[PDB]
Design a protein around this ligand. Sequence first.
Ligand code: SAM
Ligand code: CL
Length: 323
Amino acid sequence: ANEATQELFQVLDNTAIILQNELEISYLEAVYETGENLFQKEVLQKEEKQLKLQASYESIELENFSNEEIRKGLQLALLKGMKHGIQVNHQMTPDSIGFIVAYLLEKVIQKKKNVSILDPACGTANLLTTVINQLELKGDVDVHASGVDVDDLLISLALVGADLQRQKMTLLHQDGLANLLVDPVDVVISDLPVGYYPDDENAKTFELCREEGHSFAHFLFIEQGMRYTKPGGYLFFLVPDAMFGTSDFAKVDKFIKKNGHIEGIIKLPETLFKSQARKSILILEKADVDVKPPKEVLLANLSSLTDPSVTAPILAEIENWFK
Ligand SMILES: C[S@@+](CC[C@H](N)C(=O)[O-])C[C@H]1O[C@@H](n2cnc3c(N)ncnc32)[C@H](O)[C@@H]1O
Ligand SMILES: [Cl-]
């Protein structure tokens, strides 16, 4: 599409701008509200224009749009809704990055016909649904995906996006660092929250707990993720590249080595971020009886997404890395 995704976004935008004004809610909260209307084929908040909304919703038939066209349409609305006032930790992962994650999963899953995935801090699930739609694109791989988020609005947006994209996935509204009723997955992916974890009692259940004060949410997510990965499975975390140079990272490094290994660290282009400090993709493998670390960790500086002088030698290496 784009043709189709713009059509959908125009319906979402116009109707959310109405609901934003009538209900006096944020554009982002209006995107959720308009999306349930569209999905369920009702104007859900009638006792609170109604003709105008209905006409806009009936102007499209969603069955005629692909999952990716529906996702890309929501992505435009989410992006609009997160332009100001949203903290970095609540920012959705754009597919400029998600496609890169989907590509990397493609290398590790190889000729598996079933892949299970967990994002334990999933937000809007844009990353997760970008990954799902890419892997299933060929018609051979069945993805079984689970996402967890603690936030009401973001998990609601994950849930309606799943509904609108016609996904069969599991989305949990809870603390992703508490116990998860999720079976161990082939792959963990997450764009990690960075800062303090406020639940100091739950933190105690983790080896990466800090003795004094709040623990780091970003460290505990690495440990939780490894906890819910199958032996020999992989983990892909988006993290600030500055994490690696802190003295505290030595502790996470030591932890990882007791449980697996680092496969690679791929720095992402600056222009993918607002002015967000530059993130990197941390690639981990969980230990097993027939898994060894690479001879050398892949360290790649993907300073451009578009210039092949930069991308070609990096992608050529990644093409063979996991074989
Ligand atoms: C950068 S956002 C993730 C963006 C997401 N990948 C997307 O596509 O929309 C990080 C997420 O971590 C979540 N989070 C923070 N603490 C959490 C916790 N204890 N359990 C589950 N989610 C948590 C936030 O609500 C936030 O959505
Ligand atoms: Cl479909």
